[PDB]
Amino acid sequence: RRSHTIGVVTTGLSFYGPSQILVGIERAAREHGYSLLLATVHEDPDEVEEAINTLRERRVDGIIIVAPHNVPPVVFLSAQVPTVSVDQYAGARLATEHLLDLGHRRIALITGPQDWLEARERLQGWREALAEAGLPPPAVLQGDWSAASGYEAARQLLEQPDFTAIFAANDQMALGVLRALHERGLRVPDDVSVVGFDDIPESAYFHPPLTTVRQDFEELGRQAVEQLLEMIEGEEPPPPAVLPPELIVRESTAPPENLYFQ
Amino acid sequence: HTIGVVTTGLSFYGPSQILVGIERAAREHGYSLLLATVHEDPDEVEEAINTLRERRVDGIIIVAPHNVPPVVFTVSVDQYAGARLATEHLLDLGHRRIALITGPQDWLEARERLQGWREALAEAGLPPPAVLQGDWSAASGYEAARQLLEQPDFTAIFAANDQMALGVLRALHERGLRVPDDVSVVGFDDIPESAYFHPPLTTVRQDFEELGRQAVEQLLEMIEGEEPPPPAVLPPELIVRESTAPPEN
């Protein structure tokens, strides 16, 4: 009547965030005696629904969704119903308020793909920080979490440069931004300040070490397992969890040149 | 019904990309994927095999430090040939003092990349120097490089993976050493980031996703009664970017 297995539908496993979330889920599920059924969905319409009903056939005790989407109990790692997530909006606010506090006023944003709710939330936290400072929000370039998209977006921004700081919506894209800036001969942070998001292990060894917003991906996945176990069993009503984000100040930000003329 | 996989070091690109290829190869062939993770104790994999066996799994795939039918990592990439070509390239550029930052010696990739580097130098008549050991992480590459720079008796460093090579580049730039104008650096994997390092990293390409797909390909033949197939080997490729050059000695 029970399988002692947990189904998980995740995407973007080539990146650090979803992998470490998957690491947190596997370790917590195993420490409570649960095997893990892993399903990956691609950029395909409603492929998660196909994967959920596949897990349902495997008599799973519960399901954790780590992907954009929307009975065996289900837990989502977004908003939507039980949810476990990091305050993305407040994190982008910290990143943008960091730059504003240094004197930057023309702060570009390279965002993720809009089908990810985190990308929209980080966009709005950036916009609201500039609006509170009385600044109109510039035109936003869109990436896809890849370093290539960051590098390509930064080259577009450099065609007619009107910024002193770039907020890349994650660290992967920030690496490409750093690349494009070095190519053009621009120093970081002296000519252009760069802030990322995620705090992936590589970011501390970028050139220069990148200021970023830390997400605890592992604990995110463990808390998701804790929420799902409480619903599988003699409970169900869970606390909607919000994990706090943390700004990791390193070496890629500095007051702009011509500080008092910004 | 289902397929079992025991893997480790999922926070790295390589193991995660292999798992991606295993998942898609089983999703298209009607198999669900059971995931078991091991850490550093080698008595955890045999414990994780028996767990999937109790779950009545049709086949297991081992992607961790290894030795009804499991496919163990056979399917592989010629690690020895990969590091041998990288060392030969540096020698061809004129380097003669080529340091090696190896990986965890319990990993067969680490042991076999160190062998290809050693034997490439030995064929040339050169003596292999002392090796420093990392853990795949960017921190161990940075800390191993800083140790080398207490006595810079080299013009090139060969780090056993792109993660560690990023730490090496950081320790070199901190000490004001131009790359490759003063020190050449080579990695291994071709992670998506390495093309955007400062400078873009010369490295050896592994087809991780293909590696996982072949693991399921060989596994299904053992399940459907086609008997154990022969081992397969995927050739690695040397990708020469901007992090290598002849030395200025």
Ligand SMILES: C[C@H]1O[C@@H](O)[C@H](O)[C@@H](O)[C@H]1O
């Ligand atoms: C790929 C995608 O994965 C999530 O875990 C991260 O929060 C996000 O920044 C992005 O890196």
Ligand SMILES: C[C@H]1O[C@@H](O)[C@H](O)[C@@H](O)[C@H]1O
């Ligand atoms: C972390 C470890 O993962 C393996 O898949 C790679 O072959 C190796 O180079 C290293 O990256």
